[PDB]
UniProtKB/Swiss-Prot annotation, chains A, B, C, D:
The protein's assembly and partners: Homotetramer or heterotetramer of potassium channel proteins. Interacts with qvr/quiver/sleepless (via loop 2 of the three-fingered Ly-6 domain); this interaction may stabilize both components of the complex and may be required for targeting to or retention of Sh/shaker in neural cell projections.
The record's note on its domains: The transmembrane segment S4 functions as a voltage-sensor and is characterized by a series of positively charged amino acids at every third position. Channel opening and closing is effected by a conformation change that affects the position and orientation of the voltage-sensor paddle formed by S3 and S4 within the membrane. A transmembrane electric field that is positive inside would push the positively charged S4 segment outwards, thereby opening the pore, while a field that is negative inside would pull the S4 segment inwards and close the pore.
Segments crossing the lipid bilayer: 1-21, 27-46, 49-63, 65-85, 101-122, 164-192
UniProt gene name: Sh
Full protein segment contained here: 226 to 489 of 655
Protein name, UniProt field: Potassium voltage-gated channel protein Shaker
Region span, S4-S5 linker: 87-100
Cytoplasmic face of the membrane: 86-100
Intramembrane portions: 137-148, 149-156
Record motif Selectivity filter, residues: 149-154
UniProt-annotated location(s): Cell membrane; Membrane raft; Cell projection, Neuron projection; Perikaryon
Disruption phenotype: Hypersensitivity to reactive oxygen species generated by the redox-cycling agent paraquat. Reduced sleep. Flies sleep for one-third of the wild-type amount. They perform normally in a number of tasks, have preserved sleep homeostasis, but are not impaired by sleep deprivation. They also have a reduced lifespan. Males are able to discriminate between males and females during courtship but their courtship of females is reduced, suggesting that their perception and/or response to wild-type female pheromones is decreased.
Recorded superkingdom: Eukaryota
Length: 196, 196, 196, 196
């Protein structure tokens, strides 16, 4: 039984590897053997895990450019089949389910902050002949990187008022992200301790 | 009653969307219908929420370039009308009110650190023919991004002493920002738990 | 008595402002009045605060290029005279005194991580004709920004092994900085609660 | 006895310094005296510390380009001999041993997030003539810097969908890194308090 789980983990990792290397600038045969093993384990088994197992085989069987791009993207959900064997990943999923409202609150706070600071920086920088931000939508990426402290990169053309707005954005993002996490973290600690 | 709240949330989101897309490189009619609904709900209702409702209509009725830029900026405060319907945003406002002194302490610590490290980096880098920072005021943005860990970008022209100052600035900003947050976070957790 | 404290805070802020604007691309008279008030309060008073008061006047009275640069840099310690009037800054100083060993531990951990990852990235990137890092000392700044999550900037010339080293450096810096802070933070919370 | 420990710490620091300066664009004699002292203390002593002492001398005695690069890299493990004299570093090692499973969980979460977001950004950006990411493997560095909030640098060529993926990556990395650390931190606090 444990050998079968080892084989399944090996197949999952091999599928992930082959997907990454086929995206590099044969592979189809290995993918076919992976999908045969996936459907064999699906049939033997026959929940969120079952749904993930269903999704891991659909893009293989299905095969507009947008539809092809979408199916290739959803093909990556093989990585979530590790939840059957990994116990920490199950804990993470349980924690996300038990802190979905807090996740929504985080997304709402980020949305409010990003729209506010994007409008602020766009209007503060619109008083120059050469404008760094063409529009408020053009500044959402800047606002999200400043609030997440990821960093925009080159901020030289931005003027003094834009820099003040950016400093406020950095501080506010730090605060508004530090607020709702020590609830998701507490749920994760609870679930992780309960499991082990 | 709940349908009216749904309509109000839809109108608020539509106003936000139309404001963002009119800043892109019709809209006035939709904004007029939004402001009519806003004033209708204001009159039916007739606190911080009431003040926010007042501010959401003033820029429409009002209409120097600076004054126009300022009124367009304050027009973004429609997003804060969501506090009536959202409960987490009310919790955030209550937490900010109950941790205003800690917010002030954070701003004071950031100000002290930024002035200190800006002076340090400016003087450490003034001993070269090509100076990366023209003045101490020119380095406040660098100090704020280094202390917030947002990141300045390209730091190549800065010399060895400037790099030492930047390393000290990064460490000190990490410390001085991690200090006063686990008080605002505690207030937010208290208020959020009390509400739910 | 409170009016005198208000005057002292105003003079301190005015000195800070005039120092920043004289570093911009008259001022001496205002600085002279500030130093006269500083020495008047020093004489009336006549501890770390007293030492800070002593340092705030020495650079004025003193006036190699290095010595001049050093005295101008130490002239910035006027900002620390706010400790007499501010209570949070006193708490910060007390917390630093009571968590000096933890500060030293943080500096030691950062030093170990920076030397390790600088050596790693330098050796991983030395196998190319165009080397991004000339030496291990040349990579300390990269290591400190990666470990503090400030960000180096452009990392394109760095090869695959260098990128693996950088990913390890980022993770290790996150961990090694998150470790010794929840002790300094606890000391700050203790002192801040005790004061108020 | 304490003088011998002081001498050992001085020799360790001198070896680290000489290694860094010989990597700059004599040294061998100082390194020889360092290795003689290292083997003298190893013989007098004659555990992880003993293994570290063994590794600190092997590269000196040993002397393909890859093998030479590897031995020079493993030569840096002199810095870990400070564990005998430093007590905080021993605490760090004990904490890592007692939170190895949590470290593995962090690496697993980072791996899942990085593969997911690298695939997402590669597919979102493949619909343009000029593609910012050639392949999914080419985007792992971007995913790791975005998830660690280190920052990639210049993100201008990336399109709107890529920017949405990057925002999701930043938020998810913040969450997935904040989750498993308040366990390693707790172990470190426990061990540090127990030692002192
Ligand atoms: K950053
Ligand atoms: K950061």
């Amino acid at each position: 039984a444990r050998v079968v789980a080892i084989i399944s983990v090996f197949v999952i990792l091999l599928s992930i590897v082959i997907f990454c290397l086929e995206t590099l600038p044969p592979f189809f045969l290995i993918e076919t053997l992976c999908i045969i093993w996936f459907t064999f384990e699906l049939t033997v088994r026959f929940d969120v895990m079952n749904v993930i197992d269903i999704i891991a085989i659909i893009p293989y069987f299905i095969t507009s450019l947008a539809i092809l791009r979408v199916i290739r993207l959803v093909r990556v959900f093989r990585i979530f089949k590790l939840s059957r064997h990994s116990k920490g990943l199950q804990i993470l999923g349980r924690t996300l389910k038990a802190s979905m409202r807090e996740l929504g609150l985080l997304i709402f706070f980020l949305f409010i902050g990003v729209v506010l600071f994007s409008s602020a920086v766009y209007f503060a920088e619109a008083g120059s002949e050469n404008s760094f931000f063409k529009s408020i939508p053009d500044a959402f990426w800047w606002a999200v990187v400043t609030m997440t402290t990821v960093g925009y990169g080159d901020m030289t053309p931005v003027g003094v008022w834009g820099k003040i707005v950016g400093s406020l954005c950095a501080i506010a993002g730090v605060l508004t992200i530090a607020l709702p996490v020590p609830v998701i973290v507490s749920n994760f600690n609870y679930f992780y301790h309960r499991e082990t």
